Amino acid sequence: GYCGPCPNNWICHRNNCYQFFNEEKTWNQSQASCLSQNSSLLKIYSKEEQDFLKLVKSYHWMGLVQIPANGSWQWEDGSSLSYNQLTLVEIPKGSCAVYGSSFKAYTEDCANLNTYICMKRAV
Amino acid sequence: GYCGPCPNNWICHRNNCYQFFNEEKTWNQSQASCLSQNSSLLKIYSKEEQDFLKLVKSYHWMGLVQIPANGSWQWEDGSSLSYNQLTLVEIPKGSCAVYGSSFKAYTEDCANLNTYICMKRAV
Questions:
Q1: Which CATH superfamily, name and number, covers B1-123?
Q2: For A21, nearest residue in chain B (alpha carbons)
Q3: Using CB atoms, which residue from B4, B14, B52 is nearest to A20?
Q4: Most exposed of A62, A70, B53, B85 (fewest Cβ within 10 Å)?
Q5: Structural domain spans, chain A
């Protein structure tokens, strides 16, 4: 069958759309860049349905952030981080997270410059 | 727009279809597995149009083999390996090649067991 719809030249899988950007930006600028293209930073909503992402090397900003008050990690769509989605390595002080392959994420200072991955959840 | 057509749950990009198999097989068994699903082992026909593949980690069988006589490397579709497609590291004796990320390939004994990537070139 066909996969989509998706922005031109984006990778499509189960109707989810992904694109990898190597221009480095802060977490906020990365999220903004994704939003300007009608998407959001990468969200791992299901390891089973996003299996190939385990093969993505290096580190990239994803849509996982820390809440100021309670300090609870949640995705940009407001949903909360679940145990079965990925293994988050909480390294001191950082309030944003980079995806680091193998369904593992690492906390970092949001002002750090990183490449990033945008995703459009299917409808 | 839409991307495809592609086998169910395969990754689609510019209408090319890809799937990553972690069950390890010899080069021949890997090619056969791809063929049985109407595809062929991964071919890098254009670094520009297959850019995201630079991010694929580990090593996987691809459709690049050595010809018995002249010993010229060519893809499975008969086309010849071009300089601008990838950097092939010819390590002694092997007649098959594994893709090793960053558009680099490494020669290996075809009987080695490796994970593999299948691809359906667009039409």
A1: Mannose-Binding Protein A, subunit A (3.10.100.10)
A2: B52
A3: B52
A4: A70
A5: 1-123
